[model samples]
Target: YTRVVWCAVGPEEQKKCQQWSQQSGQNVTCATASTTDDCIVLVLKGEADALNLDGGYIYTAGKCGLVPVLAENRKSSKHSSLDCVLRPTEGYLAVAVVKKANEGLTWNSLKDKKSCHTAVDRTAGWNIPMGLIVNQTGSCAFDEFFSQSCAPGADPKSRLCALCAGDDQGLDKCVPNSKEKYYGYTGAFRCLAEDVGDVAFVKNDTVWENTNGESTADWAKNLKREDFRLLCLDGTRKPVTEAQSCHLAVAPNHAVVSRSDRAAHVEQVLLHQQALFGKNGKNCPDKFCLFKSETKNLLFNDNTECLAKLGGRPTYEEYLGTEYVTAIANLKKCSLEACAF
Candidate 1:
């Protein structure tokens, strides 16, 4: 019998976890964990077995001695095989974007400019960019460099919240979570579209997905991909579609992490569960679906095709790769006692 600790963000996800617990029968009893931080503590204390995490949170868990057991693989035409195991360095790219008309701006000339981000500690929006800046400046005075910014999850009274507009209720101004109107991939892009930010730090796909009427959000409904350009590290600008050669860094995909001692057990249960609830599976067609539940990505990201194998228990450096690890370390160093905000 294996006990699974499901990390849920809200009431709906908690209910879903309970339902899955019943479906797993007496052999597997599901326990609920609240936030990513809470789940990390539970797993470290041996009270929970595993938790699915975003790439950013995965780094935090890795520092706590947890290891990744399964990776969430999204089905895409970009792949040639259905195999979900990614090469250690395989993942998406992060990029800095600005309106094409803002041709004078480059990666190096960002000082004193207005900036936007997905969230405070997110890989593409915060860690990678801030890490690079720390390496160059040897400091964490991002608040000074960018002049004014909108990085949700930052201190409410900080300059980082200057450009942010909260949710419909006008609450959670600088708070993270979905409560902030400008907080995630789409939100960051919306920040740029609303002209509240001169540049938006986000994943390469952000502008593509939100532009050309592909996004239904009011701020993105009329935007076009051609309106933006990528800011390359070499101080050159290119079309947003050229991120592969002109972006900041490639980020690892998110993973399902567990304590090393329970990795095998967690993997076993996930494999069995994926067979039933994963994309195109027998049960997903009619019963409880696990992937792409219309914009719902509470515990697990939406559109997850399946949880694939990782070959073996990989160390943090082994999974995130050297470049990515170094970037994060640089950010940590500056954010620690090395520099003051």
Candidate 2:
């Protein structure tokens, strides 16, 4: 069985995991063992990424604190029962579903072939095993044409395509390709998925502490019936249809560390700040520095007033230094809570 154990990346990962699970709307299942490794082994299954000692206990990190990865009766299954959720104070999920979930969740990646390759092939690179595909000849479009000709709730174009590719195969090699024959939106999706990591506590002190094994935080609250207007790599929450839209699969203006490379992600908050402040060479009102903390929101000057004040609001990349308060506040707040738990 291909297993990925989510070992601790720092000293406070367990607390981070517990709080993170709560905030992300996933369920957290505590293991009976009091050690980090034992906790992870007991709480999660499939694979482990790492092993770490937290408060003298071993624990594992699963699903990277996005949601409780579900399985067939995984909750009750003695062998693979796993559960967890998100914690608001722990941090805000600036990014969601960045890259699609790695399928064939077995072995290290889609290259391992023993697990679910469908997700990997669609969003990531995966080499298929020789024995896995039989009589695989013709164009890759054949799979999509025959299999994805009809997606649930989508228009069906079943008219067999006629292409000019030598005219040998009628309608199959047509230029601009038939929608149902060559590809589908879900199949072509490629980008990062939900990114989970620590916030830099300070330039000097440890930014992200890993507490992989310990009791989860108690600050989690169920506020599922709320929606906050936020911008991201994907401004529109709707699914993309064509390749052009597919090319727009940008991530949220945030950063996350990669498990394989163990590298920190780049910060994308500047983009968000630009939109919020209308500072991308846009107009802004006079007195741009003040913020209304009581309302928990920001106010940008109307075009007329802003133009008269700052000569045409700051450019998208430009903004008054003081206007960056919310992003900075949120960063510190989210990071502290994520690590504290």
Candidate 3:
């Protein structure tokens, strides 16, 4: 019997891991972990076998000698390249959003305007956009560009969180975690909708999913796509779907990681289990399905359709690509001296 060490992010995730174990028909069992960082250490020490990680964490995992065994490609219109073993979902695009009424604000005219961001170092809201800004302005004084902002994860005393309204409890005001009111893709967009900021840097899907009857949030339920526009690098604006031409950058999909030597074993068990419980599997109509977690992305992204094989075990740099790597590196140089890399 093969035991898969499941690195769960919380109690809910641990419960889900137990459910997954029970359904494996005795072919597999599970061991649990508490956090992504801890999971890295567990895998390194041979106490755990695998875990799914976001692209941001992949770089760290790679540096620690972990290898990617599978990737969760979000559904997309584009086909995979020869090197892609799985075409999951269409990768989300990072873009800057402004109200159509804010016609005076172009990419170049953003100086002194209020800005909203998901969090510092996030692929869409901060890294990609700040990378470009750092390259253009050659400084880390984001406070200078935007008169005031609500960039979650930034120093609370910095002007970056000047506009942040905090959570319902008025706690974790500028904290990086979801506890912050203006955190995550949804939260940043909420900041713009509430007129707290002139522009919101977020993923393309964030706008569409939150507006025009898609979202139930009081602030987003009445929003219209026609009321918003995307800021292009060329100092122009376009509709959201025109992302291929207007987006700031494209992000890599999430992937499953394992110790290099145990990749083959992890791959075999995952492939077998996926066939029985993945999105299209026979029992999926009733059983606890993979990728169906509604409020959690503990072991994997809640939206994952499948865990498809990668053409090979790719290094973090190879998987993230040149443009993304360069952008992240550029952004890192300007990071807060006290922030952990």
Candidate 4:
């Protein structure tokens, strides 16, 4: 049983909270103050176990997962609850959601105090089935370069090993501002999409930086690859900084559609450029539509997006089950040979 918990201090705070969660790695649902009181209680019980349980209780309850906070202040207090530490002062939060979406969970026994470290998934080292929501490394100021490569096979004291490589691989090769960098956070995002059968990339207009003081696409072109499972230039959010915008997961291709809400905010201040938005779509946007749908599971080759296979990496098939491997092989073969129309 999996679950994803959603919370909002008030109605006006709903979408902001959800958007914050998305950045953290977990996508959570939002409810208005009118609805959140009931929603929060239901979520805490078991009906929403996967949605928003205290961070500490995740493991003892018997599940494998990760929770990434998209917009934490980084200086907030940590609340100890049951077996998890919940940081409420963080601007926005979300957990890698899974199982028990139908039950409820809310253990009030662990009062909010005491510092608890991020709980490690008991089965992560085993490659067991699990879910994780990842806060972007850049946002966390977590230098993947130093943390992941500085020491190999050493005790995981300061950082979790980069899962990019097959156990104990991808070490030292993880340079900063490289594909490894993009892939670290991006891969986690993609894996989340892969589990449910779809994935999409924002191709953020503001998110990228130009190294040569040139154009945006210039920076995009230097590092782009096919194996990384991402897409570009979809009309999802006009100015995504403060809109009820999200990328839809599509297989083999990426696309996004806009949803208009009365509550969507347009507060991005450059020097001017005030706009009309964020009113009706605070929590429930009226103009909702399908973003993407699950098709066949897409497979990537070594040369695929950000895959470090220029060095003879194992084929994705080697890591996949027999049925999946064969299915992917046939699909690729047909795509290259038979579907060239």
| Candidate 3, pairs of clashing residues | 73-88, 73-89, 74-88, 74-89, 74-90, 75-88, 75-89, 75-90, 76-90
**Order of candidates by lDDT, top first?**
3, 1, 4, 2
Best by lDDT: 3
Q: Candidate 2: lDDT of 341?
A: 18
Per-residue accuracy of model 3 over 242-300 as CA lDDT, tens digit each: 87899988788777888888888888888878888787776675886867654234466
Worst 10 residues of 4 by lDDT: 254-263
Model 3 quality (TM-score): 0.81
Stretches of candidate 3 exceeding 4 Å from the true structure: 10-49, 78-85, 88-90, 163-168, 293-302, 336-341
Overall lDDT per candidate, in order of appearance = 0.75, 0.20, 0.76, 0.23
lDDT of 3: 0.76
Give candidate 1's error at residue 68 in angstroms: 0.8
TM-score of each: 0.84, 0.15, 0.81, 0.18
Worst 10 residues of 2 by lDDT: 199-208
In angstroms, give how far residue 283 of model 3 lies from its true place.
3.6
Ranking by TM-score: 1, 3, 4, 2
Cα lDDT tens digits, model 4, 1-341, are 11234433333235444554453345334443322123334333433322222212222121222211111112223543421112223212211111122122111111111111111221111011111111212232222322232111223344433322222354432221112312322333333223321222222221211112222332233432222221112422122232223322111111000011100111111001101111222232332211101110011111111111011211222222243323333323211212111
